[PDB]
Design a protein around this ligand. Structure first.
Ligand SMILES: *[C@H](O)[C@H](C[C@@H]1CCNC1=O)NC(=O)[C@H](CC(C)C)NC(=O)OC[C@@H]1C[C@H]1CC1CCCCC1
Ligand SMILES: *[C@H](O)[C@H](C[C@@H]1CCNC1=O)NC(=O)[C@H](CC(C)C)NC(=O)OC[C@@H]1C[C@H]1CC1CCCCC1
Lengths: 302, 302
């Protein structure tokens, strides 16, 4: 049996129309052109020899407007520049005529978003990831991908939440929000940095166990229950996020007739082992699908 | 460690600009508007009471041009209609001004393609799948999704390979090629149909074991080797596709210094069990990534 679950991204066309190339003569990376503003990682200003301890304030001072070359695949004349956190805000003389309705938001651990991977201002692929509890994502990015963007979509409105910055020693990725902050405790410097420990996203594991029930797979469901408070105490000792219920989880509980606390108990038992059994073809807990994924893909509920 | 592998779809914008809604008064589904032609599943002509044994030849005869309502989210005036296999070809009076460069191709088992899931002519998500050895895909489709399209991209050229038709009793999906044939032995009738048995895609399992080596994970590699001929004899007895090497696999062998026949032996041993170990965080063989995925995402080679 197939669960009906796939890694589903938003259609990317509206964001593709916003991608540009930004060059400073050292690095080339991607930017996001909205209205009269082009957003891009500030390490475009960095010569390669200084990526390990850049002094971005001094680099910024050393630039003028024509230090930046912006191209859409048009040349966009830069008429202002500023730095916000780990991002540059370039003002250009032409408003993007394809600017979608948009907001800037921060994504929280466990939540999914879509990524448009771009190289040299050209969109090359799209994928979806969940923000990990340690503020990394398990992405697919190579040299030249910085400035690739992550977003969610509410209706017609694109909520931009991520601009790609760097790969960590363990192959995971991180980037900035459009307030210029890096996710987590990371710095946009190419040096060893402590990485917080990752954790299983409990709410998403619950979502996946509900997807299993919705597919007729419920061997792991017993009358036994663990309260949210008790589970969260356990979680802190076992590399699980604390569980916080949402209306999307509640909708899964209503549809299946299985209580959240029954699946919190199940998780505690499954964590110790699947005892040779499988759940939706897996022998380990899956936390890469959200309650909203399950509601939308299996139940049709957005 | 993260492998650097994700399920990567093409950017969807060029195909989004080709999607329309087609209605006959019973069903509404999606169509693909290229040049002056709109392609859509022929069961748009079907009243719901007849989806189990439709007589499509008689339905076709009963239609006229204005039996079909085509809308882009514009109304497109239908000025000709024809049936090719399980698809209708509607001729419209306006050429799609956003028609990309395109071809029609058939996809083969093990190969990946991108899907744009659409409802009521509106793109709603994108995902990637591999064509299974039994000519199904493990997709995510609900009522109203027929006419959603699958495609690959070579350069600027979109190779359309799939138009969605139906869900099978086991939750998997199938559809047609743009020559009008259904993939596999399936019929576009809503009745019980025998499903061929699925198999592990050996070439993709080899690709994934190479991705593991490229990530520093090679515990399963021994000097022991199994020839292609011997492996393929084994595969026929063990629900594996026969292995056929390609230049993309050869490139992985060259980069890692590990021979194909070493990984064919590894597969034969791993099939019987991982003995408590993991490979790229999995306890079972993974066949949803292609040699080309591994070359592109990990090595940068398209
Ligand atoms: C921008 O395109 C680029 C994206 C990276 C490149 C490879 N994959 C990606 O996702 N980002 C960078 O090159 C970034 C630049 C700094 C933020 C200024 N540097 C980066 O990602 O470097 C990666 C290497 C692994 C980290 C340094 C090691 C850490 C562990 C100790 C040894 C050094
Ligand atoms: C078109 O949008 C639609 C897509 C389907 C609906 C649900 N998920 C999908 O992917 N396609 C159909 O509705 C299709 C129409 C026929 C081809 C004319 N019918 C379809 O997919 O029916 C699905 C149900 C499961 C199959 C019938 C059972 C088979 C096993 C025995 C019992 C009947």
């Amino acid at each position: 049996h197939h669960s009906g679950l796939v890694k589903m991204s938003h259609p990317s066309g509206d964001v593709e129309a916003c991608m540009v190339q930004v060059t400073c003569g050292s690095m080339t990376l991607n930017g996001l052109w909205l209205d009269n503003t082009v957003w891009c990682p500030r390490h475009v200003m960095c010569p390669a020899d200084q990526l390990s301890d850049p002094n971005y304030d001094a680099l910024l001072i050393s630039m003028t407007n024509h230090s930046f070359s912006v191209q859409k695949h048009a040349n966009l004349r830069v008429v202002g520049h500023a730095m916000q956190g780990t991002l540059l805000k370039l003002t250009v003389d032409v408003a993007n005529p394809s600017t979608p309705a948009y907001t800037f938001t921060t994504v929280k651990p466990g939540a999914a978003f879509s990524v448009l991977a771009c190289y040299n201002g050209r969109p090359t692929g799209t994928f979806t990831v969940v923000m990990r509890p340690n503020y990394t994502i398990k992405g697919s990015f190579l040299c030249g991908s910085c400035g690739s963007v992550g977003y969610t979509k509410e209706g017609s409105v694109i909520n931009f939440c991520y601009m790609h910055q760097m790969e960590l020693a363990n192959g995971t990725h991180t980037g900035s929000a459009f307030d210029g902050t890096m996710y987590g405790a990371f710095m946009d410097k190419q040096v060893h940095q402590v990485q917080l420990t990752d954790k299983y996203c409990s709410v998403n594991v619950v979502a996946w166990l509900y997807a299993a029930i919705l597919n007729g797979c419920a061997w792991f469901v017993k009358p036994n229950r663990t309260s949210v408070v008790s589970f969260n105490e356990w979680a802190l000792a076992n590399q699980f996020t604390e569980f916080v219920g949402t209306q999307s989880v509640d909708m899964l509980a209503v549809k299946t007739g299985v209580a959240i606390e029954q699946l919190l108990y199940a998780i505690q038992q499954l964590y110790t082992g699947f005892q040779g059994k499988q759940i939706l073809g897996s022998t380990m807990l899956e936390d890469e699908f959200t309650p909203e994924d399950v509601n939308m893909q299996i139940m049709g509920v957005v």
